[PDB]
Design an enzyme around this catalytic site. Structure first.
Site, PDB file in Angstrom:
ATOM      1  N   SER A 136      -6.052  -2.882  -5.867  1.00 26.79           N
ATOM      2  CA  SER A 136      -4.775  -2.469  -5.297  1.00 26.79           C
ATOM      3  C   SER A 136      -4.528  -3.188  -3.979  1.00 26.79           C
ATOM      4  O   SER A 136      -5.446  -3.401  -3.184  1.00 26.79           O
ATOM      5  CB  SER A 136      -4.741  -0.955  -5.081  1.00 26.79           C
ATOM      6  OG  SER A 136      -5.140  -0.256  -6.242  1.00 26.79           O
ATOM      7  N   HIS A 180      -2.661   4.960  -0.888  1.00 27.24           N
ATOM      8  CA  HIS A 180      -3.813   5.557  -1.548  1.00 27.24           C
ATOM      9  C   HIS A 180      -5.123   4.894  -1.140  1.00 27.24           C
ATOM     10  O   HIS A 180      -6.174   5.542  -1.164  1.00 27.24           O
ATOM     11  CB  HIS A 180      -3.624   5.493  -3.062  1.00 27.24           C
ATOM     12  CG  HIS A 180      -3.950   4.161  -3.655  1.00 27.24           C
ATOM     13  ND1 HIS A 180      -5.235   3.777  -3.970  1.00 27.24           N
ATOM     14  CD2 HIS A 180      -3.154   3.116  -3.981  1.00 27.24           C
ATOM     15  CE1 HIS A 180      -5.215   2.556  -4.473  1.00 27.24           C
ATOM     16  NE2 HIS A 180      -3.965   2.131  -4.488  1.00 27.24           N
ATOM     17  N   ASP A 186       3.959   4.731  -2.677  1.00 29.88           N
ATOM     18  CA  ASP A 186       2.514   4.703  -2.442  1.00 29.88           C
ATOM     19  C   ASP A 186       2.179   3.500  -1.571  1.00 29.88           C
ATOM     20  O   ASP A 186       1.223   2.761  -1.813  1.00 29.88           O
ATOM     21  CB  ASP A 186       1.714   4.683  -3.748  1.00 29.88           C
ATOM     22  CG  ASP A 186       0.219   4.910  -3.529  1.00 29.88           C
ATOM     23  OD1 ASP A 186      -0.191   5.141  -2.371  1.00 29.88           O
ATOM     24  OD2 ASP A 186      -0.546   4.847  -4.514  1.00 29.88           O
TER      25      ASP A 186
END
Lengths: 48, 153, 153
Positions: free
Chosen positions: B104, B30, B52
């Site tokens: 992230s 992402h 992801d």
């Protein structure tokens, strides 16, 4: 001629057999592939 | 200390990070944009959308420098970039609202100096922040964890 | 040490070494030359390219003068003829550039001097070089470790 060439019978047994053989291979490959995609999805959920 | 880690530069923004674990570079999928290091960017990462995440062998000049992944995850406090984070009931938990978008791909560090997990984002129930993380079962199976209503960062 | 390990000469120039463990003589198969001994060199060799090594057995006059084998391989630093080496997570890692060509066949020794691995070569990179040493499973079964891009020494 005394009867029409109905397609369901114009295919010879040998010919129809090979036709169903090839379509059987393709259909089995797609169905088995889908089943494998289903089973593989279960793999992670069975171990988390 | 965590200088063996590398954020992704998207439009000059650190929208995410990446870590070299076991000689494979891993970054969240992402997290759009290009990684900082040009040699790492030459790696054509392989994605695993269910996690992801995307992975790929780091080039032969720095695989020695990789962080060691950690199987063991006993309950306790684990090092991070934003200080340290508690691990409880199988989930990493963090002070309410600290950390957020852009974090992230930040690795979580074993006090021994090893990486235990990589964060994707979090959530709040109201009492505490719950993190979403990629993990490894005791057996060694790599997994992804996402609390209820997880938000990616 | 050289008490139980021996140099190989390329017609007069050293170019390799051979090791005797449990009385079995062992030498990397890609290293040409003859051991600097008239008793050891006389032994016939069996060779297996899947192990990149060839082996024989010493005469009974020197059955007592061999490296003792072991498979006790806990992660940690091990002693080596060119300074210690680090073994971790199933990898043998050493400071950069030490050894190189002609240094293969050098064994790795336990604190008690028990041999744990034999150098075939390795890869030169980053903070540490990784050796492509032949080791064994916990079950005592020989294994060849060949980290990607390793070169024979």
């Amino acid at each position: 001629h005394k009867v029409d060439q109905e397609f369901q019978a114009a295919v010879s047994k040998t010919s129809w057999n090979w036709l169903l053989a090839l379509f059987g291979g393709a259909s089995s490959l797609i169905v088995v592939g889908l089943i494998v995609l289903v089973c593989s999805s279960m793999l992670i959920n069975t171990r988390r | 200390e965590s200088d063996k880690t590398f954020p992704i530069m998207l439009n000059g923004q650190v929208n995410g990070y990446a870590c070299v674990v076991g000689g494979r570079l891993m970054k969240p999928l992402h997290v759009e944009g290009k990684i900082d290091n040009e040699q790492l960017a030459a790696v054509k990462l392989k994605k695993a959308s269910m996690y992801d995440l995307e992975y790929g062998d780091v080039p032969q000049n720095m695989k020695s420098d990789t962080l060691q992944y950690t199987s063991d995850k006993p309950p306790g406090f684990y090092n991070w970039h934003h200080g340290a984070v508690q691990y409880e009931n199988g989930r990493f938990t963090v002070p309410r609202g600290v950390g957020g978008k852009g974090d992230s791909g930040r690795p979580i560090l074993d006090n021994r100096g090893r990486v235990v997990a990589i964060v994707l984002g979090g959530a709040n129930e109201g009492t505490r922040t719950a993190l979403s993380v990629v993990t490894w079962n005791q057996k060694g199976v790599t997994i992804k964890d996402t609390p209820e209503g997880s938000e990616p960062w």
